[PDB]
Amino acid sequence: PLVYTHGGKLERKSKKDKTASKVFEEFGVMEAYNCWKEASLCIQQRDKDSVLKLVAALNTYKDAVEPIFDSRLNSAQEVLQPSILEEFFEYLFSRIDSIVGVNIPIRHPAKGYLSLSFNPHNIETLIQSPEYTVRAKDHDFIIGGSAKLTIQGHGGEGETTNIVVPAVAIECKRYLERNMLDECAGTAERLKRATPYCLYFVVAEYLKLDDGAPELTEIDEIYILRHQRNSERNKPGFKPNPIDGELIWDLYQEVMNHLGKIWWDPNSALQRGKVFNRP
Amino acid sequence: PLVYTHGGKLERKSKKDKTASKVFEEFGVMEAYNCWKEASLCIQQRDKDSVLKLVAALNTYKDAVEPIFDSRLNSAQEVLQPSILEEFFEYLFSRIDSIVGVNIPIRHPAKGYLSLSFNPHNIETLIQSPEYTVRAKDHDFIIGGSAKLTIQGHGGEGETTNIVVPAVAIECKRYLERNMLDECAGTAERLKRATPYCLYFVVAEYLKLDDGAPELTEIDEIYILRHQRNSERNKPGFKPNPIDGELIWDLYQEVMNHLGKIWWDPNSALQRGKVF
């Protein structure tokens, strides 16, 4: 198995909560899930209809399962539903190796690198082997690479830390309220300092944002997948929109573009006379 | 109305340095300059060919005087040479009032607002009349507005400061090296915090190649006008490329769009959503 973020939380949640285990048994969550997974992995191409099909299965599984997580559970809006989308992105980008050339080690939730700072214990350790911190940051989904960072002082053979250098990072939220969109603006800033070529998206199903006023962030795209407000979800009669396959198709197109580009290329700068060729 | 930055630095430099004054007359800098100016003001339209024409005059004037500035002048890349493009932008945007609807006060070099912090002398002045500082930053060229900022205490008239709130800010550099592109990243960050809707450009003639991946954190566009490297200028065979009128045409098009757009809209920014 590649990653399967959702599937694993299913098995972990049922391995720690026996209540939940029976709920998953009784309402056939596990069959629903396996079905979703099977449906998704067999989609081999990535033309628009291919992608639309994945979204189709996504909608189905969410329709089949989310109501159980809402009414039959207790704590399922923390790391049980936010993972359906995480795993979805795993499927969406399962077949990119063959298409972008190389074998990308990271296409799951991951801590994306931000900073390296030095916190030596004392003058001796400073000289001999300075203690350091790498600050990273949880993202719901990262396409990127794994690196080893080592610091050696006079003595040691160096403390090593494993780090993740992201090329795309995606936040995945059921609904996007202002509190969260501030976090995301905030880490976009940091993220762009650390990894200037990391594309950064926030993706939500609903937008729970009070009309307020517009925000210049360093986020490359926000996506509200169901085109709806959150005011609508807990009122008279249900009726949620499907997750819009169009948006996912777009998001896919932009990421693949990104992984296609040489990101510095001064030669093409000089050639054109612009560093930021936006057509 | 119409500011003339280069002309004035010519005028300043010569009242100051009398050696340079003689150099200016001997090599006919003054005639060259006003010719450049004359040529430029009489182009009134702003279609693509119009703009190309201005660039033509630009290239000529640069060709006519830059050599003098290099050879015959002590120190000239400080402001003398950079001011040419500054003034050029003055000509390029001289007819925007009639095109954008409003009478824009500022289209010259200017200090663009950045921050307000409070540094009161003591507890009394804190209450009574707090002392403050406005931090602004020199830009090569700004389209924007003037504003007056007043702070009033408990009892008093309030200290006023004049400030400039830019809509477009353009840096103008002959050549762009890593060291400078960091400065520009650095002030872009500040600038975007202070004035989120201010477009921010760097415009250069030559750009250094091998130097290292730079920080272009929040610069809206860089322009290398001559498409060349900055290491070909002091080699056996000169051969500098003309400033590319295509690029200037672009830059013009981007700025005019910017000034045409509604920027901030407090209560009609829901549809925006997830397009663009």
Residue numbers in the entry:
A (entry chain A): 7 to 285
B (entry chain B): 7 to 282
Can I see the authors' text?
BbvCI, a Type IIT restriction endonuclease, recognizes and cleaves the seven base pair sequence 5′-CCTCAGC-3′, generating 3-base, 5′-overhangs. BbvCI is composed of two protein subunits, each containing one catalytic site. Either site can be inactivated by mutation resulting in enzyme variants that nick DNA in a strand-specific manner. Earlier mutagenesis of these residues confirmed their catalytic nature and demonstrated that the site in the R1 subunit cleaves the bottom strand of the target site, while the site in the R2 subunit cleaves the top strand.
Purified samples of wild-type BbvCI, containing a 1:1 ratio of R1 and R2 subunits yielded crystals under acidic conditions (pH 4.5) in the presence of an excess of duplex DNA oligo containing the target site, and 2 mM calcium chloride. However, after derivatization with heavy atom compounds ‘I3C’ or tantalum bromide, the space group was converted to C2221, with only two subunits (one dimer) in the asymmetric unit. We initially calculated MIR phases, built an initial structure, and conducted refinements using datasets corresponding to the latter (heavy-atom) space group, and then subsequently determined the final, higher resolution structure of the native (non-derivatized) protein in the original C222 space group via molecular replacement and phase extension. The resulting electron density maps clearly corresponded to two full-length protein chains, but no density corresponding to DNA was present. In contrast, modeling the electron density as a homodimer comprising two copies of the R2 subunit resulted in satisfactory values for Rwork and Rfree (0.189/0.249, respectively), excellent correlation of the model to experimental electron density, and significantly improved geometric quality. An intervening four-stranded, anti-parallel beta-sheet (residues 116–175) protrudes from this core. This interacts in a domain-swapped manner with its symmetry-mate in the opposing subunit, to form a dimer interface corresponding to an elongated beta-sheet. However, the two sites in the protein dimer are located ∼45 Å apart from one another–too far away from each other to catalyze double-strand cleavage reactions producing a 3-base overhang.
